[PDB]
Amino acid sequence: APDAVFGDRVRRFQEFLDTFTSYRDSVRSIQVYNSNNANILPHRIIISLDDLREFDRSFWSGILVEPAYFIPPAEKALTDLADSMDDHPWKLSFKGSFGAHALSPRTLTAQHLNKLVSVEGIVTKTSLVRPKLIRSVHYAAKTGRFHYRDYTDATTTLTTRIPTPAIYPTEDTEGNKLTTEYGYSTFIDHQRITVQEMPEMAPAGQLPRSIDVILDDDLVDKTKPGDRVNVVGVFKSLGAGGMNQIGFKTLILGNTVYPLHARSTGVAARQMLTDFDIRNINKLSKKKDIFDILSQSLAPSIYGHDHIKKAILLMLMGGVEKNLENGSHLRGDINILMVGDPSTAKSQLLRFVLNTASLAIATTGRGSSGVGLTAAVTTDRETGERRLEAGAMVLADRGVVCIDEFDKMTDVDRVAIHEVMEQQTVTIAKAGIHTTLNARCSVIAAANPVFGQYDVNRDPHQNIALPDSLLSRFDLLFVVTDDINEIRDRSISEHVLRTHRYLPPGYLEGEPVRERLNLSLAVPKLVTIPFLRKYVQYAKERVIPQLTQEAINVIVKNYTDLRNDDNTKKSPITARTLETLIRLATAHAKVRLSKTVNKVDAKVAANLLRFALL
């Protein structure tokens, strides 16, 4: 029967939902969607814990401290408003600043039980999504009547109830036999996941701590193993810890699950674009020095190397791939290789690409070997089946892979990369498993000269020492050297000393600067690094240029000319060069946001290739 306290807690949350009206229209929107569009959306909204502090302090403190008394009231209050604006229950989500309830699996203790918490870590394993039976319907052929029953369990209501163990009906109240109507019963899905502390926040050489999260219905398939995640929910004690006859059974009943992005991880980074942002992105295009402004802002601290600055942007945007009715796939990724002297900032260039790209994985020479790049087979304890867990290149699909110290790899891995750089498929034929996986990735790499330093007397085949088959699979092979000089020594020295003296905004000189780990959230003046990602993200999703009848003649001339010319080149010439020219041409048209490839872009591609060749 009605409780006064429940009623007042509902009333105050009705007033809260009335004062800040940004949540009512959000509820309106989902009904508008599910009616006008008949992908049915789930019945949920998100609340800010910062708004609650301003509106009411005690109600805020109560959800932080006593969720099991203030959450069902708020949910019922929300359901009432939903049924009000209406011409299936509803549930809430939580965001804002939590404070002392922003914990990790190691610092989460028994004094935080029965409160709402935020937990950080890595997802290590997910289970199979299973149906759960709620209501079952039956039929009696001797009376022409249908009967039903309801089932419930302890992980669906935040407060403790008196158990009702009902049974599965096979028989009528007179004895008539009942047929089970599987299509008329209701089933709701279930999944369980385990979380662990992230490897770069955990103490070195110490065993890790983990926590179990239970998800149901709509939150059931949001993540995969090996992800950075933030979860919010109630830390619940269950059952009796052996007092009917280790301790109590503890787990989190999830309500919010946020994917997070980190360096060298399989979760991509995306940002929400404001119309103001779009206006600047589109304004920048018309000025006909877009390429130079964007190129010089690519790690401006390294000096020169402007053509590699161009090439990295061309790889970051990339062309277009094409599928024919036949069933043929034609590649559209660009790959870069760099050979130079042992103090030419190769690793700074690689690390910058790792920091800026939306999805990137870092590998160093012999570091990754064999299965570590392609895939490996494991066994599942429960079902007993043999499964696959992804290697580096399977994870970096529609992305970039950074290979530092490229020349240190064995031939066995080289033959495996031959298949990824051209067909972009990985084929596995192990005991019982025969499957093909997708790996559509671009590759950037850096290599050391065989003789320590580049020898101008000898020809390239004696300095590089890589097979022609692998060389042809790289679109661009750049060579760089540091010529000892005085003019450039002065110029470089002065600039490098400029850089080494820089105050971050807001410190008195002397004060040490402070380091923090950057965890993201997923959904001629130089341009800011945070804006370059916004530019690229729009430039890939929106523009898909088509080929014109003009520039084909330029490409044809350049390819024919190169193949019937007799200068010693830094790479062999094949049909791969023919396709490379088109990929390069379409990348520049992605830079310009035009719907068609053009002649100026074709000549920029040709100029770049010829500089990198001769």
């Binding site: 029967a1 009605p2 409780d3 006064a4 306290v5």
Partner: protein
């Protein structure tokens, strides 16, 4: 819960002050009840 609560149009702290004021104010047309109580003090009244 298993013991539900209800709301009634009463308040005991509110009426206790009214009881006190009546017992330390009433002078019928020294104060009446406070003279009854002064006789109570000296063991000269039982009810």
């Amino acid at each position: 819960a298993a013991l539900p609560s209800i709301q009634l149009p009463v308040d005991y702290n509110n009426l206790f002050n009214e009881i006190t004021d009546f017992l330390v104010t009433f002078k019928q047309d020294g104060p009446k009840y406070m003279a009854m109580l002064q006789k109570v003090a000296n063991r000269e009244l039982n009810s």
